[PDB]
């Protein structure tokens, strides 16, 4: 929502530091290179991790709003007393 720039700067820094001629021989080398390159040529675990993650994040939002309401309740429970 509103993120203090001190946290913005530390979080970015934390994330960005965790990123981790007339010859036939040569023609046959081209096929060979493209044959291994072809052999060398979104995961289900990414999809299931981002699902849990976003579910937590959205649940934290209403959990925040719940605490804020319960916070004003305690204030007038202080305020009256």
């Amino acid at each position: 929502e509103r993120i203090p720039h001190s946290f913005f700067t530390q979080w970015n820094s934390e994330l960005d530091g965790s990123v981790r001629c007339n010859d036939k021989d040569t023609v046959d080398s081209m096929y060979k290179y493209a044959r291994k390159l072809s052999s060398l040529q979104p995961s289900s675990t990414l999809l299931t991790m981002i699902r849990q993650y976003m579910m937590e994040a959205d649940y934290q939002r209403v959990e925040i709003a719940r605490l804020k309401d319960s916070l004003n309740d305690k204030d007038e429970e202080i305020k009256k007393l």
Partner: protein
């Protein structure tokens, strides 16, 4: 601390799902096309050079044929005079024999 491990793991996975493990310039597509065009020019030059050698060959063979025609003309005449020469020698010898008795 601040950046959760789950936050890092998801970002890393996404980073690896977007990176191009085969850049077309990098894998050599343009170099191969460069080679086709280069070979095309060499092939064209050879076909052109072969065309001119045929034109050089037709002239060389024609002049050789003309020389051989001349060689036969000269040989026929040479042999002909040599034939008359031998006859005159036979005739001269006989005349000397008459004078010599």
């Amino acid at each position: 601390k601040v950046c959760g491990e789950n936050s890092r793991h998801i970002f890393n996975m996404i980073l690896n799902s977007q990176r191009p493990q085969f850049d077309i310039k990098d894998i050599g597509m343009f170099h191969l096309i460069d080679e086709i065009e280069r070979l095309r020019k060499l092939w064209k030059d050879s076909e052109e050079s072969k065309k001119r050698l045929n034109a050089d060959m037709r002239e060389a063979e024609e002049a050789l044929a003309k020389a051989r025609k001349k060689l036969a003309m000269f040989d026929i005449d040479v042999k002909d005079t040599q034939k008359h020469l031998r006859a005159l020698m036979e005739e001269n010898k006989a005349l000397k024999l008459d004078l010599n008795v």
